[PDB]
Amino acid sequence: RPRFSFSIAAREGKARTGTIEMKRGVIRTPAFMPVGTAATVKALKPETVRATGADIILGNTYHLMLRPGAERIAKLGGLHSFMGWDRPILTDSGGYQVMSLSTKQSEEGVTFHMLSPERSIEIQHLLGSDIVMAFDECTPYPATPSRAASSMERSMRWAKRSRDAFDSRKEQAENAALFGIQQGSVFENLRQQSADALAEIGFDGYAVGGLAVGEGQDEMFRVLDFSVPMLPDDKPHYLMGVGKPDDIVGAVERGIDMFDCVLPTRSGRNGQAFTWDGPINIRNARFSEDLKPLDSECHCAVCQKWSRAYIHHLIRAGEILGAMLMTEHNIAFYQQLMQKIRDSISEGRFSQFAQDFRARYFA
Amino acid sequence: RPRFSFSIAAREGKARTGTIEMKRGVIRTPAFMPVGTAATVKALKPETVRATGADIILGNTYHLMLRPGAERIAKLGGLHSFMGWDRPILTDSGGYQVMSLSTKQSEEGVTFHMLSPERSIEIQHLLGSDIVMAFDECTPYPATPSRAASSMERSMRWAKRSRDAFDSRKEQAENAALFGIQQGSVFENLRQQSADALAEIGFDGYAVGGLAVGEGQDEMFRVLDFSVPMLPDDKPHYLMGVGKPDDIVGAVERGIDMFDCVLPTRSGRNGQAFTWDGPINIRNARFSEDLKPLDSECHCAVCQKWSRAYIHHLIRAGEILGAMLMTEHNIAFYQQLMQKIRDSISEGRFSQFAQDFRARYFA
Numbered sequence A, B: 001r002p003r004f005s006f007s008i009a010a011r012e013g014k015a016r017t018g019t020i021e022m023k024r025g026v027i028r029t030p031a032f033m034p035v036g037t038a039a040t041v042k043a044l045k046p047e048t049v050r051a052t053g054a055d056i057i058l059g060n061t062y063h064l065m066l067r068p069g070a071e072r073i074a075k076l077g078g079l080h081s082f083m084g085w086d087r088p089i090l091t092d093s094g095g096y097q098v099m100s101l102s103t104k105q106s107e108e109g110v111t112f113h114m115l116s117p118e119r120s121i122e123i124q125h126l127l128g129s130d131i132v133m134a135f136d137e138c139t140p141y142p143a144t145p146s147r148a149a150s151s152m153e154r155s156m157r158w159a160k161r162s163r164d165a166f167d168s169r170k171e172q173a174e175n176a177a178l179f180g181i182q183q184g185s186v187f188e189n190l191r192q193q194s195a196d197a198l199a200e201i202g203f204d205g206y207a208v209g210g211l212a213v214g215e216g217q218d219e220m221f222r223v224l225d226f227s228v229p230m231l232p233d234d235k236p237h238y239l240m241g242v243g244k245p246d247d248i249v250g251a252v253e254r255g256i257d258m259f260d261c262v263l264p265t266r267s268g269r270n271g272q273a274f275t276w277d278g279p280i281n282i283r284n285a286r287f288s289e290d291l292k293p294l295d296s297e298c299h300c301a302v303c304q305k306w307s308r309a310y311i312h313h314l315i316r317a318g319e320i321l322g323a324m325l326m327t328e329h330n331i332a333f334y335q336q337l338m339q340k341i342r343d344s345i346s347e348g349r350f351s352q353f354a355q356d357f358r359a360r361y362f363a
């Protein structure tokens, strides 16, 4: 089992499919990562997360540093042992959540309590993270060229510090991997600058940051169109915070290999279930006596046993079992979507799938 | 598979152990019944409920009639299919919950919307219930002899109507069982009257109602001491709403065969975990870094994988996984307790177990 090895087994247009091999397991790409804020994928046992098909989950550095604390988790044995997930875990750097949830921004780091590239990397280390994200700053939207160019440059300076900070910890540099994050809002030249700086520094994977921050899909794809190709080709492409079904498909078409989103998890607890015929709000009075499963084709355990009527009942009653079932279904649905995407690329029919998917999903 | 057959395989003092065979499954007695208010045992999949060892769960008639509705559940296929539990389900009559949650009391029934012995039995029928409880009135505490004697008499009149109402539905009388409920507060003569009236009417099992309503353990045992022996011996004895660990033990000593309680479920979601060394509030700051399981001997899946520190973290953070794990552990603990009780009675050492249990549980 190598530390980190990405191989592409099939392509079609900019879309790719393959695997990322790591010490804790193999990750099939394009991949969807369930989000594990607070050392738990909301409402699911790790085994249930694994059963839906997930090969890797995302853990948040911001939230865990506060509660229960990095050193503490490290003392208990690391995040994997703490939550009971023994497969790869990717941990965000915290830059995104800090400037979103709690601010004194300088060059050393950020204050809300100082969080610096150096500290971020150590935190991800104590957690026992498999894929460390470089500490950065997600530029808000909109953002004048100047602003977008300031954040980006500072980010790129943090990228270098993140890299060195990572390479100094012998046991970390040898067991985990490091991804750099490109920034630069919706500006072509800024994206390019960022890409070059990152490639110059060297990273195991490259994420596209600062998107899906409010610019809408059209814009996002447009930006993705020139940005993704800037990143090296023989390395994984990670689109951060993107997860609407339709978004994943388009991003994969444009070359993205990894996704992470709370939509599946959060949407579920609230009453939205994803189906191949588009989403549905199970709370609707029209499912009250519907004996059909959430989705007619879904292979998840929830769609094999319970009806929409039952789940409708659970959700309107505010029962925990309701959130459990909805969430298992949504994540399972997302993983089936990723499976259909990998398979279609391996067969050279991704283009048609993408087309058949949108027709039905939006019919 | 018979409709309802109770057999005692071992005894010691007033304690008994045996099985209750029904069409949907065998029930090992003394038995503990997880409470399923709203067609779901809070935070658990039916399989997980079964995994803890439960042979039967209790469903509430009051709550289900309101939401989602009896006829509706019957239309979807019955409670078993609706929630995904194919084993026996005992359904309370609703008398208890009506005069507790929402009142116009007469002889025909109760108004809060009329709920009558006749309607109660039909509701339990539409639900597809295996053990139907007679519709009754749980006398509040305290209660002057006169009051306690009024409720009781009316209850006993309802017992008769419940019985006939039950025997008229050919397919119900042939597949389900009917329990009568003794009432009479803490008064010996009233309890006796009730017992005779019930035995005169004839029932498949007898429950002891109106206890654990605020009289405290000492009083409850005292009342149980003369009340339990009044009920027939070759039939199951059901103590309603009793579940504190120590309470179950004492009641079994006094002849009780069946228990139902929310303590396990509700207590869990709130932060209390049962251990053989007494309960603990996992929220306490002293478990923050405790790598030991909830209980050192518990065989449940939760105690096999996660630590008190992790669960401590989940509960303080208000995470759903926290309630899931705590609840699975508590119900599993209750079932292990029942297993230890059945085994000790089968070996003639229940007395010593009861003694060893209290010494440690309260040390």
Ligand SMILES: NCc1c[nH]c2nc(N)[nH]c(=O)c12
Residues within 6 Å of the ligand: A092, A093, A094, A095, A096, A133, A136, A137, A138, A139, A181, A208, A209, A210, A211, A212, A213, A240, A241
């Ligand atoms: N929507 C952009 C985004 C999501 N998550 C992120 N995490 C980091 N570190 N940076 C980013 O720009 C983002």
Ligand SMILES: NCc1c[nH]c2nc(N)[nH]c(=O)c12
Residues within 6 Å of the ligand: B092, B093, B094, B095, B096, B133, B136, B137, B138, B139, B181, B208, B209, B210, B211, B212, B213, B240, B241
């Ligand atoms: N604590 C007494 C009790 C619990 N559940 C009950 N259900 C019914 N029908 N009657 C009762 O008296 C009780």
Ligand SMILES: [Zn+2]
Residues within 6 Å of the ligand: A294, A295, A298, A299, A300, A301, A302, A303, A304, A329, A330, A332, A333
């Ligand atoms: Zn499903």
Ligand SMILES: [Zn+2]
Residues within 6 Å of the ligand: B294, B295, B298, B299, B300, B301, B302, B303, B304, B329, B330, B332, B333
């Ligand atoms: Zn346990």
